[PDB]
Amino acid sequence: GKECDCSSPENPCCDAATCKLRPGAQCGEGLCCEQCKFSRAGKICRIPRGDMPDDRCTGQSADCPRYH
């Protein structure tokens, strides 16, 4: 449609026609969006490199902020 819950038409969470969530789901895409759902707080959303801290799900967003 004219509004998407996903970025991709290939996204399983979305139907291609609607571009929008079929399932009993929360989200389609996002670093903290797992199983088309909002991942739990503290779960690693991003792998660090070098001296950086690992970024963690808030459990209050489909996208990851920073570290929480």
A tleap script that builds the chain and sets N, CA, C and O, in Angstrom:
source leaprc.protein.ff14SB
mol = sequence {
  NGLY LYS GLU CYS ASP CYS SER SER PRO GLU
  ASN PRO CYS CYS ASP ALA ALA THR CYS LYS
  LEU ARG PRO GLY ALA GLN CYS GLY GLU GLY
  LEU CYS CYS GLU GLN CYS LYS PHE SER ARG
  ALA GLY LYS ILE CYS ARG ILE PRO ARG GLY
  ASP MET PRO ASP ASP ARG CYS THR GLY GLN
  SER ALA ASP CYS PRO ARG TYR CHIE
}
set mol.1.N position { 0.823 -1.197 0.000 }
set mol.1.CA position { 0.000 0.000 0.000 }
set mol.1.C position { 0.866 1.261 0.000 }
set mol.1.O position { 1.996 1.261 -0.490 }
set mol.2.N position { 0.309 2.325 0.559 }
set mol.2.CA position { 0.975 3.616 0.543 }
set mol.2.C position { 1.654 3.850 1.895 }
set mol.2.O position { 2.121 4.948 2.197 }
set mol.3.N position { 1.693 2.791 2.693 }
set mol.3.CA position { 2.384 2.843 3.970 }
set mol.3.C position { 2.854 1.444 4.376 }
set mol.3.O position { 2.128 0.459 4.239 }
set mol.4.N position { 4.080 1.389 4.876 }
set mol.4.CA position { 4.740 0.114 5.098 }
set mol.4.C position { 5.103 0.014 6.581 }
set mol.4.O position { 5.430 1.009 7.228 }
set mol.5.N position { 5.038 -1.205 7.094 }
set mol.5.CA position { 5.604 -1.501 8.398 }
set mol.5.C position { 7.012 -2.071 8.222 }
set mol.5.O position { 7.800 -2.137 9.166 }
set mol.6.N position { 7.301 -2.477 6.994 }
set mol.6.CA position { 8.616 -3.007 6.672 }
set mol.6.C position { 9.281 -2.062 5.667 }
set mol.6.O position { 8.641 -1.179 5.097 }
set mol.7.N position { 10.574 -2.275 5.471 }
set mol.7.CA position { 11.299 -1.564 4.431 }
set mol.7.C position { 11.323 -2.395 3.148 }
set mol.7.O position { 11.411 -1.863 2.041 }
set mol.8.N position { 11.244 -3.706 3.328 }
set mol.8.CA position { 11.402 -4.625 2.215 }
set mol.8.C position { 10.060 -5.280 1.883 }
set mol.8.O position { 9.278 -5.624 2.770 }
set mol.9.N position { 9.813 -5.446 0.556 }
set mol.9.CA position { 8.685 -6.240 0.097 }
set mol.9.C position { 8.962 -7.735 0.268 }
set mol.9.O position { 8.048 -8.559 0.264 }
set mol.10.N position { 10.239 -8.056 0.416 }
set mol.10.CA position { 10.644 -9.432 0.642 }
set mol.10.C position { 10.408 -9.821 2.103 }
set mol.10.O position { 10.468 -10.994 2.472 }
set mol.11.N position { 10.140 -8.810 2.915 }
set mol.11.CA position { 9.982 -9.019 4.345 }
set mol.11.C position { 8.787 -9.941 4.592 }
set mol.11.O position { 7.699 -9.737 4.055 }
set mol.12.N position { 9.026 -10.981 5.436 }
set mol.12.CA position { 8.014 -11.991 5.685 }
set mol.12.C position { 6.918 -11.452 6.607 }
set mol.12.O position { 5.765 -11.881 6.550 }
set mol.13.N position { 7.309 -10.507 7.450 }
set mol.13.CA position { 6.389 -9.943 8.421 }
set mol.13.C position { 5.289 -9.195 7.665 }
set mol.13.O position { 4.134 -9.156 8.087 }
set mol.14.N position { 5.682 -8.607 6.544 }
set mol.14.CA position { 4.745 -7.860 5.723 }
set mol.14.C position { 4.282 -8.761 4.580 }
set mol.14.O position { 5.023 -9.619 4.101 }
set mol.15.N position { 3.043 -8.545 4.159 }
set mol.15.CA position { 2.623 -8.945 2.828 }
set mol.15.C position { 3.114 -7.913 1.811 }
set mol.15.O position { 3.263 -6.731 2.119 }
set mol.16.N position { 3.359 -8.392 0.600 }
set mol.16.CA position { 3.899 -7.542 -0.447 }
set mol.16.C position { 2.840 -6.518 -0.864 }
set mol.16.O position { 3.150 -5.371 -1.186 }
set mol.17.N position { 1.593 -6.964 -0.847 }
set mol.17.CA position { 0.502 -6.154 -1.361 }
set mol.17.C position { 0.245 -4.987 -0.405 }
set mol.17.O position { 0.142 -3.832 -0.819 }
set mol.18.N position { 0.145 -5.320 0.873 }
set mol.18.CA position { -0.120 -4.318 1.889 }
set mol.18.C position { 1.157 -3.545 2.225 }
set mol.18.O position { 1.122 -2.360 2.555 }
set mol.19.N position { 2.277 -4.248 2.130 }
set mol.19.CA position { 3.539 -3.710 2.606 }
set mol.19.C position { 3.497 -3.663 4.135 }
set mol.19.O position { 4.277 -2.959 4.776 }
set mol.20.N position { 2.568 -4.428 4.693 }
set mol.20.CA position { 2.118 -4.187 6.053 }
set mol.20.C position { 1.914 -5.527 6.762 }
set mol.20.O position { 1.670 -6.556 6.131 }
set mol.21.N position { 2.020 -5.482 8.083 }
set mol.21.CA position { 2.114 -6.702 8.868 }
set mol.21.C position { 0.883 -7.570 8.601 }
set mol.21.O position { -0.257 -7.127 8.745 }
set mol.22.N position { 1.145 -8.810 8.211 }
set mol.22.CA position { 0.119 -9.839 8.252 }
set mol.22.C position { -0.130 -10.284 9.694 }
set mol.22.O position { -1.242 -10.180 10.214 }
set mol.23.N position { 0.956 -10.791 10.335 }
set mol.23.CA position { 0.806 -11.714 11.448 }
set mol.23.C position { 0.359 -10.981 12.714 }
set mol.23.O position { 0.113 -9.774 12.702 }
set mol.24.N position { 0.262 -11.738 13.795 }
set mol.24.CA position { 0.122 -11.145 15.115 }
set mol.24.C position { 1.447 -10.542 15.587 }
set mol.24.O position { 2.027 -10.972 16.584 }
set mol.25.N position { 1.903 -9.542 14.848 }
set mol.25.CA position { 3.270 -9.071 14.986 }
set mol.25.C position { 3.258 -7.611 15.444 }
set mol.25.O position { 2.222 -6.946 15.435 }
set mol.26.N position { 4.431 -7.138 15.840 }
set mol.26.CA position { 4.573 -5.761 16.279 }
set mol.26.C position { 5.248 -4.923 15.191 }
set mol.26.O position { 4.772 -3.851 14.819 }
set mol.27.N position { 6.364 -5.442 14.698 }
set mol.27.CA position { 7.189 -4.692 13.767 }
set mol.27.C position { 7.647 -5.642 12.658 }
set mol.27.O position { 7.452 -6.855 12.731 }
set mol.28.N position { 8.258 -5.057 11.638 }
set mol.28.CA position { 8.766 -5.838 10.523 }
set mol.28.C position { 10.294 -5.791 10.473 }
set mol.28.O position { 10.959 -6.802 10.244 }
set mol.29.N position { 10.825 -4.597 10.691 }
set mol.29.CA position { 12.257 -4.381 10.569 }
set mol.29.C position { 12.751 -3.454 11.681 }
set mol.29.O position { 11.974 -2.728 12.301 }
set mol.30.N position { 14.055 -3.501 11.911 }
set mol.30.CA position { 14.635 -2.838 13.067 }
set mol.30.C position { 15.643 -3.748 13.771 }
set mol.30.O position { 15.524 -4.973 13.751 }
set mol.31.N position { 16.632 -3.116 14.388 }
set mol.31.CA position { 17.743 -3.852 14.968 }
set mol.31.C position { 17.255 -4.621 16.196 }
set mol.31.O position { 17.829 -5.639 16.584 }
set mol.32.N position { 16.186 -4.110 16.789 }
set mol.32.CA position { 15.644 -4.706 17.998 }
set mol.32.C position { 14.343 -5.426 17.638 }
set mol.32.O position { 13.611 -5.899 18.507 }
set mol.33.N position { 14.083 -5.493 16.341 }
set mol.33.CA position { 12.877 -6.142 15.853 }
set mol.33.C position { 13.223 -7.589 15.494 }
set mol.33.O position { 13.765 -7.873 14.427 }
set mol.34.N position { 12.894 -8.486 16.414 }
set mol.34.CA position { 13.161 -9.900 16.207 }
set mol.34.C position { 11.859 -10.700 16.278 }
set mol.34.O position { 11.022 -10.484 17.154 }
set mol.35.N position { 11.715 -11.622 15.337 }
set mol.35.CA position { 10.481 -12.376 15.209 }
set mol.35.C position { 9.309 -11.431 14.933 }
set mol.35.O position { 8.182 -11.663 15.371 }
set mol.36.N position { 9.607 -10.368 14.201 }
set mol.36.CA position { 8.589 -9.393 13.846 }
set mol.36.C position { 8.055 -8.766 15.136 }
set mol.36.O position { 6.939 -8.248 15.182 }
set mol.37.N position { 8.878 -8.828 16.172 }
set mol.37.CA position { 8.442 -8.433 17.499 }
set mol.37.C position { 9.556 -7.638 18.184 }
set mol.37.O position { 10.708 -7.648 17.751 }
set mol.38.N position { 9.181 -6.957 19.255 }
set mol.38.CA position { 10.142 -6.188 20.028 }
set mol.38.C position { 10.936 -7.093 20.973 }
set mol.38.O position { 10.394 -7.664 21.919 }
set mol.39.N position { 12.224 -7.205 20.690 }
set mol.39.CA position { 13.083 -8.098 21.448 }
set mol.39.C position { 13.163 -7.636 22.905 }
set mol.39.O position { 12.823 -6.500 23.237 }
set mol.40.N position { 13.619 -8.543 23.755 }
set mol.40.CA position { 13.657 -8.278 25.183 }
set mol.40.C position { 14.775 -7.284 25.510 }
set mol.40.O position { 15.724 -7.114 24.744 }
set mol.41.N position { 14.635 -6.641 26.659 }
set mol.41.CA position { 15.628 -5.678 27.103 }
set mol.41.C position { 16.928 -6.412 27.439 }
set mol.41.O position { 16.930 -7.423 28.142 }
set mol.42.N position { 18.023 -5.877 26.922 }
set mol.42.CA position { 19.342 -6.325 27.332 }
set mol.42.C position { 19.973 -7.220 26.262 }
set mol.42.O position { 21.180 -7.463 26.260 }
set mol.43.N position { 19.126 -7.698 25.361 }
set mol.43.CA position { 19.587 -8.562 24.287 }
set mol.43.C position { 20.444 -7.750 23.316 }
set mol.43.O position { 20.168 -6.583 23.040 }
set mol.44.N position { 21.485 -8.397 22.813 }
set mol.44.CA position { 22.450 -7.718 21.964 }
set mol.44.C position { 21.806 -7.415 20.609 }
set mol.44.O position { 21.381 -8.317 19.886 }
set mol.45.N position { 21.746 -6.131 20.292 }
set mol.45.CA position { 21.166 -5.698 19.031 }
set mol.45.C position { 22.296 -5.521 18.016 }
set mol.45.O position { 22.110 -5.697 16.812 }
set mol.46.N position { 23.464 -5.170 18.535 }
set mol.46.CA position { 24.607 -4.889 17.683 }
set mol.46.C position { 25.881 -5.479 18.292 }
set mol.46.O position { 26.109 -5.400 19.499 }
set mol.47.N position { 26.696 -6.066 17.428 }
set mol.47.CA position { 28.010 -6.532 17.835 }
set mol.47.C position { 29.012 -5.384 17.718 }
set mol.47.O position { 29.067 -4.682 16.709 }
set mol.48.N position { 29.818 -5.211 18.800 }
set mol.48.CA position { 30.806 -4.146 18.837 }
set mol.48.C position { 32.007 -4.482 17.952 }
set mol.48.O position { 32.111 -5.579 17.403 }
set mol.49.N position { 32.903 -3.513 17.831 }
set mol.49.CA position { 34.230 -3.781 17.305 }
set mol.49.C position { 35.265 -2.890 17.997 }
set mol.49.O position { 34.979 -1.758 18.386 }
set mol.50.N position { 36.466 -3.432 18.135 }
set mol.50.CA position { 37.512 -2.752 18.881 }
set mol.50.C position { 37.158 -2.664 20.366 }
set mol.50.O position { 36.991 -3.677 21.046 }
set mol.51.N position { 37.051 -1.433 20.845 }
set mol.51.CA position { 36.995 -1.189 22.276 }
set mol.51.C position { 35.565 -0.809 22.668 }
set mol.51.O position { 35.289 -0.450 23.812 }
set mol.52.N position { 34.673 -0.899 21.692 }
set mol.52.CA position { 33.312 -0.424 21.873 }
set mol.52.C position { 32.504 -1.396 22.736 }
set mol.52.O position { 32.748 -2.602 22.742 }
set mol.53.N position { 31.519 -0.823 23.477 }
set mol.53.CA position { 30.539 -1.637 24.176 }
set mol.53.C position { 29.514 -2.218 23.201 }
set mol.53.O position { 29.243 -1.650 22.143 }
set mol.54.N position { 28.957 -3.357 23.586 }
set mol.54.CA position { 27.856 -3.942 22.839 }
set mol.54.C position { 26.587 -3.122 23.084 }
set mol.54.O position { 26.302 -2.703 24.206 }
set mol.55.N position { 25.843 -2.907 22.010 }
set mol.55.CA position { 24.583 -2.189 22.102 }
set mol.55.C position { 23.464 -3.173 22.445 }
set mol.55.O position { 23.450 -4.314 21.983 }
set mol.56.N position { 22.533 -2.700 23.261 }
set mol.56.CA position { 21.549 -3.584 23.866 }
set mol.56.C position { 20.135 -3.065 23.597 }
set mol.56.O position { 19.900 -1.860 23.508 }
set mol.57.N position { 19.208 -4.005 23.471 }
set mol.57.CA position { 17.812 -3.659 23.276 }
set mol.57.C position { 17.319 -2.929 24.528 }
set mol.57.O position { 17.672 -3.278 25.654 }
set mol.58.N position { 16.500 -1.913 24.297 }
set mol.58.CA position { 15.750 -1.296 25.378 }
set mol.58.C position { 14.607 -2.209 25.823 }
set mol.58.O position { 14.260 -2.273 27.002 }
set mol.59.N position { 14.038 -2.909 24.850 }
set mol.59.CA position { 12.748 -3.548 25.046 }
set mol.59.C position { 11.613 -2.522 24.994 }
set mol.59.O position { 10.503 -2.769 25.464 }
set mol.60.N position { 11.926 -1.372 24.413 }
set mol.60.CA position { 10.946 -0.306 24.292 }
set mol.60.C position { 11.076 0.383 22.932 }
set mol.60.O position { 10.682 1.536 22.757 }
set mol.61.N position { 11.636 -0.353 21.984 }
set mol.61.CA position { 11.830 0.174 20.644 }
set mol.61.C position { 12.095 -0.971 19.665 }
set mol.61.O position { 12.629 -2.018 20.032 }
set mol.62.N position { 11.708 -0.742 18.418 }
set mol.62.CA position { 11.996 -1.695 17.359 }
set mol.62.C position { 13.421 -1.467 16.849 }
set mol.62.O position { 14.072 -2.379 16.339 }
set mol.63.N position { 13.881 -0.234 17.002 }
set mol.63.CA position { 15.252 0.102 16.655 }
set mol.63.C position { 16.068 0.276 17.937 }
set mol.63.O position { 15.535 0.611 18.996 }
set mol.64.N position { 17.366 0.041 17.811 }
set mol.64.CA position { 18.266 0.183 18.943 }
set mol.64.C position { 18.702 1.647 19.028 }
set mol.64.O position { 18.982 2.292 18.017 }
set mol.65.N position { 18.753 2.160 20.287 }
set mol.65.CA position { 19.262 3.499 20.529 }
set mol.65.C position { 20.787 3.535 20.417 }
set mol.65.O position { 21.346 3.977 19.413 }
set mol.66.N position { 21.437 3.060 21.469 }
set mol.66.CA position { 22.838 3.378 21.690 }
set mol.66.C position { 23.502 2.291 22.537 }
set mol.66.O position { 24.512 1.704 22.148 }
set mol.67.N position { 22.910 2.042 23.695 }
set mol.67.CA position { 23.409 1.007 24.584 }
set mol.67.C position { 22.278 0.423 25.434 }
set mol.67.O position { 22.503 -0.409 26.313 }
set mol.68.N position { 21.067 0.879 25.147 }
set mol.68.CA position { 20.213 1.433 26.183 }
set mol.68.C position { 20.733 2.811 26.595 }
set mol.68.O position { 20.150 3.457 27.466 }
savepdb mol mol.pdb
quit
